[PDB]
Design a protein around this ligand. Structure first.
Ligand SMILES: [Cl-]
Length: 92
């Protein structure tokens, strides 16, 4: 299962540039994603590549659910995001 994601800095937990659009496998884990992100941010906002990030998913009621790092993206999508839109993911 291919998964599209849009990543944004958590709007209150990060100090107020980019939106990042990613397509990947539903088999990738949330942890893999946070490690990928640590590598991206170390270079793109320049070890810092070792820094850890928490991943949140936007909820319909305007909240943010922390995603367990062991969950596959396919499981994330089943649990929290069934809809036909890229997953709206936030990091801090
Ligand atoms: Cl945007």
């Amino acid at each position: 299962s291919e998964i599209e994601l849009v990543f944004r800095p958590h709007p209150t937990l990060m100090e107020k540039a980019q939106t990042r659009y990613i397509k990947t496998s539903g088999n990738a884990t949330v942890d893999h994603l946070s490690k990928y992100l640590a590598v991206r941010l170390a270079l793109e906002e320049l070890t810092a590549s070792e820094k850890q990030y928490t991943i949140y998913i936007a909820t319909a009621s305007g909240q943010f659910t922390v995603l367990n790092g062991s969950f596959s993206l396919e499981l994330v999508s089943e649990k929290y995001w069934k809809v036909n839109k890229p997953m709206e993911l936030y990091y801090a």
